[PDB]
Design a protein around this ligand. Structure first.
Ligand code: MET
Lengths: 147, 147
């Protein structure tokens, strides 16, 4: 249930999220009102989850980034870890995952020493063991593909 | 230099990418013209690299997501795998990593079967072994934190 017009909108809004209703309208061949109203439909079903500035983590002082795969110390607590980690500001993402581990987190931090303190907070707040994979360089990210 | 007037701007823009040069200024104790200005220099200095709507990937047909860890097969060739995979569009992100593999990709795809295809394509286009980890669920993604 996603027509051609809706495809053009989400493609445009991936590429440019500050773009304005009139720009959008003249690109989809619609009135600024039919645009507004379609864009509100997108947002209220779950198609557009919100809108964000892409910030350079380096520039605001997150010089170390890492993947941390976490698995439950006792796999019979009911599974909680995403809820309980939600309040560690430095966890940016949390996925559950098939395989030997249960979740993968992407985490950003000031330095090597700050990473060790965060790994302790993690181990303790979700009661979890950790496997860390430091990122050396990001070549490109979030490049959303609308087919 | 990141005058923590600029911090509140980016905390603001991070949570609301369509927040308006107008309604920003009140949340921030500046003028409409002062506020708009920095934003233009914030983007200039590469601190805000872009504005995106966060699209839900299932809702656009991407029912299976995976991290795919790759490592080049022949160490005597130049290691240029991000450049080679860059044209392949279902790769959304590519990181060099300090781990077992040389790189991690995040990849989205229509089904299990389409993944198998995409992996053969990754293997023959870069020249790499693939080891891949299916994401079951995204609890939260990209919550940017500004110290
Ligand atoms: C996030 S549920 C844990 C899944 C587990 N890693 C499995 O493969 O069975």
């Amino acid at each position: 249930a996603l027509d051609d017009i809706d495809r053009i909108l989400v493609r445009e809004l991936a590429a440019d999220g500050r773009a304005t209703l009139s720009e959008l309208a003249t690109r989809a061949g619609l009135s600024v009102s039919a645009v507004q109203s379609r864009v509100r439909r997108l947002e209220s079903r779950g198609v557009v989850q919100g809108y964000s500035a892409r910030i350079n983590p380096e520039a605001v002082g997150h010089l170390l980034s890492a993947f941390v795969a976490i698995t439950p110390l006792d796999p019979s607590q009911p599974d909680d870890a995403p809820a309980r980690l939600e309040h560690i500001e430095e966890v940016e993402s949390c996925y559950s995952v098939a395989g030997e581990e249960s979740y993968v987190l992407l985490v950003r931090v000031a330095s090597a020493r700050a990473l060790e303190d965060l790994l302790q907070r993690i181990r303790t707040t979700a009661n979890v063991r950790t496997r860390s994979t430091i990122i050396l360089n990001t070549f490109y990210s979030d490049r959303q593909h609308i087919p």
